[PDB]
Amino acid sequence: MGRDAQRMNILAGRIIAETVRSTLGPKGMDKMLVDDLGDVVVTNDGVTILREMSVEHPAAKMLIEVAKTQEKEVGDGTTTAVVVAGELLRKAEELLDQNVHPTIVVKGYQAAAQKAQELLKTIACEVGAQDKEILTKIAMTSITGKGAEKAKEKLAEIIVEAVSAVVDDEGKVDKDLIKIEKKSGASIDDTELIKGVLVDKERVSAQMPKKVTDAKIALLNCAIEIKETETDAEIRITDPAKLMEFIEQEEKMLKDMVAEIKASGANVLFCQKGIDDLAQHYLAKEGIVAARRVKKSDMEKLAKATGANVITNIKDLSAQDLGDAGLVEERKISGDSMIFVEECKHPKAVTMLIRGTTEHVIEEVARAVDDAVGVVGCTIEDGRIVSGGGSTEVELSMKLREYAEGISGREQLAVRAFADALEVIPRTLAENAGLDAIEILVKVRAAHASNGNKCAGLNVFTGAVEDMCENGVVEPLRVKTQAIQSAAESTEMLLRIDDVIAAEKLR
Amino acid sequence: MGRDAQRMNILAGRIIAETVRSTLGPKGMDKMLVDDLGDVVVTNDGVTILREMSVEHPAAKMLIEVAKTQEKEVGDGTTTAVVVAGELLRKAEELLDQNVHPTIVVKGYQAAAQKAQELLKTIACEVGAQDKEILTKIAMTSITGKGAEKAKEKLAEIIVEAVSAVVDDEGKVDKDLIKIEKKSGASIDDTELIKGVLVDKERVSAQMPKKVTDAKIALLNCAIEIKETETDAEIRITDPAKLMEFIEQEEKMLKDMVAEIKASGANVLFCQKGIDDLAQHYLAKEGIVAARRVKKSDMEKLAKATGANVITNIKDLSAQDLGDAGLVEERKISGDSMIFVEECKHPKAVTMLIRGTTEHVIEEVARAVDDAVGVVGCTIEDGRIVSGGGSTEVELSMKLREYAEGISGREQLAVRAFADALEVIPRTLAENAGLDAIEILVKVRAAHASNGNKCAGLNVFTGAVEDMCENGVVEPLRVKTQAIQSAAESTEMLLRIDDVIAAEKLR
Ligand SMILES: Nc1ncnc2c1ncn2[C@@H]1O[C@H](COP(=O)(O)OP(=O)(O)OP(=O)(O)O)[C@@H](O)[C@H]1O
Ligand SMILES: Nc1ncnc2c1ncn2[C@@H]1O[C@H](COP(=O)(O)OP(=O)(O)OP(=O)(O)O)[C@@H](O)[C@H]1O
């Protein structure tokens, strides 16, 4: 009973752990996912693989739940954590044949995790905020498995210039709002960096100007038209010449309503609903930008950038509820028509537009930008950049072997197993090649046996061995520490189960 | 797992790739397609075969989706692209037996594609816009598998004279609107080239003239009859002698309404709906062409050709909303009756009418005209006409073999395989014959081993070997480059799959 239900839980986890094994290197194979209706999709990363997966077995759920909590942190060390956890489980499964029972292995892993975390903090350097040439290599190496055939130089010079705006001034809080729009076009690969406001909404009546200098943005909500809500106090009619007079008065009231806004100092009108065609001419004889259908996601970016308040009615508008803009234009680019408002006041956030050919290419960039800025915000606030490319694990493996010699007991085999399991990263990063096999792992192991030589690792774009800091691979340390912590926490939630029962009571 | 799900994806693609293998040469067999209701159709091309096909397998869908995106470009290199992709897959399947795993083959294909594209741009010539005898051979060779028993001389002298109208003047933008009507007749094969407007609508009252000199076309929409819409403001009646007087006035108003149009300068009436029989006599005493039921597809060709606007009402017609025509006639040709308007003003587009015997012959021409003009618009704008008939692949195969000798490694076998796979076109073009077998491929291979001799290829109308530019085969280069690009892009979406999973979540 103790050994029957224990091996099944490990076998059920090793199947889902080795699924994202091939989707780890920069030049790895993708995954084709089909559905019952007939939706064939292609996924190259490993985050989407863990979501759309048959979680019918209880063992194939806790690991995914743990990985989802770690992916929402930095979003980079998700697949490697699952690979390390699977390697640890496979290494610990063989150690159960000596009849020692799972207990000392957990203590050994807990003792080795602290040593690894202490050693990782001593193999890094100090990166200040006055650098610039160092902050671009991390952005260049962040886009490898997504699509290096078009994103390797153009997408590495516009992210650093866009993020470095409020992070260098305040190195603590830099929570921005970055929105990526999924739209196609006709070009190969075009990247636009809008330094203003982007509105994704067209019109139907092209009878309004689209070039106003130093215009002012005025945010107006509802309660503007004649009928939009309801009225509890009902009214009555007496003479037929009174209703027509009231209608004419309510129609002419719009003239003075627009004149008041013009005299207050505003030339841009942003309404939540739609603007009637009869209210356009009144906005054309005075030079006021007419717009309609403003999404809340696009409207919330106007109060913190231009500087204006909202009006719940129509008679609550004065002079302090106005903003300031630069140039509002409506160009037809990439098929659809979008509104560009340039020169605001406080350039906090930024907008990035990607134009490709079909429809699956732009989406491929949608999962690449969010994973490219996340490695930047954790760089200025920290600065413990280590040597990426599978060099930290090999360096820690040579230290754990000599550190485990100072202790006596059955806990040394656990530390040795944890140290040997760290060599799975170079075996997976070199499996995608044909001229690597196993000689690369033997050559990179005896190279770090001297005094120095630490930045050397492995690159799949050459074949030989060289330094990683001189090429352009500078993976941070947080993405490794969080991955190691997740792997050490997930490997203990399965060995401490042993038996499994069932019940008919909810919760 | 890695080799089990990989071979099945290739075997599922090789079945659908070799289906359109026989439908490639000019004298190949057709395909009989049946349905569940009992619809037996015959298809000779390969574009329709990819559409009406059981796409129940996930592997037999991505290739069709890629081919559909390439067919909408020039519409000529669709079947050959699928054949090349299937040949590449079959050649790469055998290379997986040496335990190399798919990675270096993709790099070899990517390196060979650029070399092939660079070599294709150096084996062409320069074709200017002052030529005329060269622009007819491409149109003559464009109709081979459709029906060369009646289309080889008559259909090769009316396409060049119809396209060469606005392309020679502006060699950049030549987007026209060509419409092919599917109508039968009684003759063997008749081709009419209307240099005006063609309306496919008859009448019921043959009481109007059909021969007016220098008539003017006036476009009038609805809002003409007494009742066609609705009225919100209801009316009442007081005396019985008032409703009859109003009806008589509204009936007599048509007289002055037609008199105003006659005095404005118009003799042709084109209405969207139908014209009542009582409104015909008023159009007969003044010499005005009466017509009814005008389709939007036939009405949109009147504003850009004759030069006239539309009227949403009836009282908005003056003098500037009129056009100009030449001769409007209604002849009964090929059974049905059609309206011919000759001598317009701006002959932008053109109309082609095909008359056959039964009903499946004319449709056979319907899939031949669209594939005959598409190879012309890409000729004047480009001009890199190469030697067609399966001569570019044999020429590039002799160059790739000597180009792959300058590199060392496992990538040479991929380039050699890609070069050997290009010899499938001459084997498929010679399989339809009996006296070809394999000696033709051996004879055409050692012929290009000297200095010159490049225009020589293969013709199925003789048996021996000779030049292709002197016969009448001048296939352009764009249809080959796009096909090679599609074949290189489709062969990489299957080898990078390896494993395949499933899920129960939508999208
Ligand atoms: N040129 C390179 N040389 C060495 N290693 C590289 C190189 N490029 C990328 N890598 C490695 O690839 C890893 C990233 O792989 P990829 O972006 O394909 O998926 P991932 O981001 O690891 O997926 P997940 O975020 O789900 O873990 C990095 O950890 C990095 O060490
Ligand atoms: N007289 C000829 N000599 C040599 N080759 C010819 C001759 N006539 C046609 N061909 C070849 O036949 C091919 C066209 O075949 P066909 O028109 O039957 O189908 P297709 O247009 O290739 O179909 P798809 O457009 O789906 O690819 C051309 O690529 C051309 O090279």
Residue numbers in the entry:
A (entry chain D), B (entry chain C): 10 to 516
Text from the published report:
Both share a similar domain arrangement, in that each subunit consists of three domains: an equatorial ATP-binding domain; an apical domain that is involved in substrate binding; and an intermediate domain that enables communication between the equatorial and apical domains. By contrast, group II chaperonins occur in archaea and eukaryotic cytosol and have a built-in lid segment protruding from the apical domain that opens and closes with ATP binding or hydrolysis.
To assess the mode of ATP binding by MmCpn, we incubated the chaperonin with a low, non-saturating concentration of ATP and froze immediately. In contrast, the poor resolvability at the upper domain consisting of intermediate and the apical domains indicates the absence of D8 symmetry in these regions within or among the MmCpn molecules, i.e., the apical domains exhibit high conformational heterogeneity in response to ATP binding. These results demonstrate that, upon ATP binding, the MmCpn complex demonstrates low structural variability in the equatorial domains and high structural heterogeneity and flexibility in the upper apical domains, leading to the apical domains averaging out among the MmCpn particles.
